[PDB]
């Protein structure tokens with residue numbers, strides 16, 4: 001079997017990567033947990049086995065076959081090239097390698113073929129992007145895609161473990177202490193790295209990540225550029241508004257598309273239902289539609305509210321929901337690792353294409 | 358001065374109607390609070406005065422100059438025509454009279470001119486519609502509007518007092534008792550009238566009101582049809598997705614528009630800032646944008662995240678936030694009443710144009 005390393009094992013995604021690996025089919029002979037120096041020495045479970053957390057260093061990757069990175073862009077930038085040098089195949093959850101031409105940006109149901117020519121690093125797309133790709137690929141295959149307009153309803157777990165705890169504290173201070181939401185103190189959201197912080201309790205924050213030069217945030221721009229790479233079509237127009245809402249787990253998306261050819265709605269529903277990873281939850285007569293709370297804990301992407309635009313001949317609206325820590329992150333990574341195993345792609349890379357930092 | 362009646366004084370909107378009337382310039386000689394049999398006999402404050410709540414009847418409107426209705430569509434359907442017959446001018450918050458050709462559907466900053474030919478009933482648009490009209494009207498005036506695509510982030514107070522309490526209860530059960538959101542019992546949301554109910558706590562429900570025969574909800578279709586009437590242009594293409602989120606007060610909206618002529622973003626910002634009732638909150642360098650929690654308690658509509666589409670030349674995205682109980686409901690109604698006073702339009706209507714349902 002393989003030696004599998006989890007880099008960032010203590011975090012929000014890291015905990016779910018452990019769960020996904022525990023339930024995986026991957027033949028694992030040895031599992032290692034990697035994090036920062038402050039977590040080194042602490043014990044963490046794998047099934048009913050005790051694993052000691054190690055510090056992530058340049059020389060900590062010898063003997064490793066697969067490394068699952070989920071410890072922030074900074075950690076992947078520094079240590080992933082050393083992993084590749086050690087013969088590891090890296091699956092990275094961070095944004096750092098996503099737009100590198102030598103790095104496949106993969107959603108297994110959409111572009112597994114991109115894995116074949118990998119150079120030691122496979123990039124997982126952004127959580128908000130992934131679920132959109134699963135929903136839209138079956139539509140693109142049959143009727144094409146001209147444009148996408150998306151407004152997101154994103155969970156706080158997307159910003160990490162700290163953001164969950166901040167959201168929970170704030171809500172308790174309003175409900176238990178009677179503090180007005182506008183008077184709350186915040187330290188993480190909307191973006192930990194940014195200059196100012198705002199409450200999320202009873203709020204909708206139209207900022208995820210930091211702002212770019214064109215007044216869109218990096219989150220919105222990631223959705224644009226990642227879609228183009230994943231679907232291998234730069235002509236697809238994509239514009240996004242990414243919003244954080246008071247939900248702990250699971251992202252929701254209001255998605256508008258225009259197809260190249262008129263796509264009958266009942267055929268659209270059937271195509272999405274037949275697509276691997278996508279579940280049709282669409283029966284308005286019985287108020288059936290995807291819901292954040294129902295999606296939590298599931299690997300599937302749930303699609304509903306499918307209806308044609310009231311005016312645009314080729315326009316379609318839909319509602320897309322998936323667990324941001326699973327398909328949005330940890331499950332997508334483990335699924336990639338499983339696909340790599342299937343295709344005999346877990347082996348050292350001879351040519352090193354990534355600069356050592 | 359006027360005798361003013363508040364119909365549905367005990368509800369979520371009613372409480373804000375009282376606050377808005379207390380802070381109003383309207384000369385009020387007498388205030389009357391009307392509700393259902395459930396609240397009749399109880400007492401509510403108007404400033405310092407104790408006002409006894411009365412049961413709403415067909416005969417309750419004698420001597421009333423202005424009646425502000427926010428007590429459900431059935432209440433307006435049953436009693437508003439009797440108020441008009443009695444000589445009252447009605448301002449209605451419900452959906453019942455909104456699409457009636459004899460009824461002005463008014464946002465004062467957009468179409469106050471429609472008030473002049475009123476027949477005793479003036480309709481307030483839906484809360485989600487109003488704030489979008491305030492944000493978009495200045496844009497339409499200069500560059501026109503071809504289409505609108507909107508996804509809403511709506512507060513639970515939109516569904517009434519019971520919905521607020523249900524949301525607070527559910528959140529307290531999860532955060533204090535450790536109840537799983539999936540295990541929560543719901544009774545009201547997404548829609549009180551509909552067959553099935555779902556938890557809102559840590560959830561996003563893509564249903565507001567009930568579904569229509571075209572698979573859009575009534576909320577989504579009201580945004581479409583109300584826009585066309587308010588802006589007096591049936592050619593404006595409008596499609597909406599309306600979603601309830603775990604917020605008590607203030608709706609937020611992600612609005613996409615395509616203009617008729619290219620509208621420079623810096624000029625769009627300036628036009629919105631200059632428009633009465635609209636406040637520009639747009640400085641991304643300092644992370645300034647409209648926020649639900651900041652809009653609560655304010656009559657203004659806040660607009661930000663204004664940016665052109667990445668591909669469509671005439672496309673613009675923006676973020677619109679307003680208190681759904683104020684500009685979305687109570688303040689719009691009071692503002693209409695004040696405008697009626699300004700234009701000398703508070704007087705009886707001679708010809709009855711609305712069916713009496715209790716004959």
Ligand SMILES: NC(=O)c1ccc[n+]([C@@H]2O[C@H](COP(=O)([O-])OP(=O)(O)OC[C@H]3O[C@@H](n4cnc5c(N)ncnc54)[C@H](OP(=O)(O)O)[C@@H]3O)[C@@H](O)[C@H]2O)c1
Pocket residue numbers: 007008009010011012013014034035036037038039040056070071072073075093094095125126127157158159160161162324325328329
């Ligand atoms: N959360 C999501 O829904 C989501 C979805 C897709 C992608 N991602 C991406 O995944 C990454 C992690 O997200 P998260 O939500 O899991 O964050 P998180 O909860 O804050 O966890 C961060 C993890 O990184 C580790 N770490 C920090 N600095 C390190 C260092 N210098 N060396 C080694 N390990 C270090 C931490 O270990 P210690 O405990 O020792 O500090 C911790 O385990 C982010 O880059 C994010 O963009 C997240």
Ligand SMILES: NC(=O)c1ccc[n+]([C@@H]2O[C@H](COP(=O)([O-])OP(=O)(O)OC[C@H]3O[C@@H](n4cnc5c(N)ncnc54)[C@H](OP(=O)(O)O)[C@@H]3O)[C@@H](O)[C@H]2O)c1
Pocket residue numbers: 364365366367368369370371391392393394395396397413427428429430432450451452482483484514515516517518519681682685686
């Ligand atoms: N909430 C919003 O953001 C919003 C915005 C725009 C428009 N509206 C509209 O306003 C209306 C209600 O507003 P809300 O959200 O404040 O609802 P709410 O909190 O549930 O209050 C409903 C009010 O209606 C009264 N009522 C019920 N049945 C009655 C009857 N048979 N006769 C006389 N009064 C009766 C109730 O009085 P009792 O206490 O005696 O039961 C109560 O005061 C709805 O039609 C809604 O469409 C609401």
Ligand code: NA
Pocket residue numbers: 272273274275276277278279280
């Ligand atoms: Na499927």
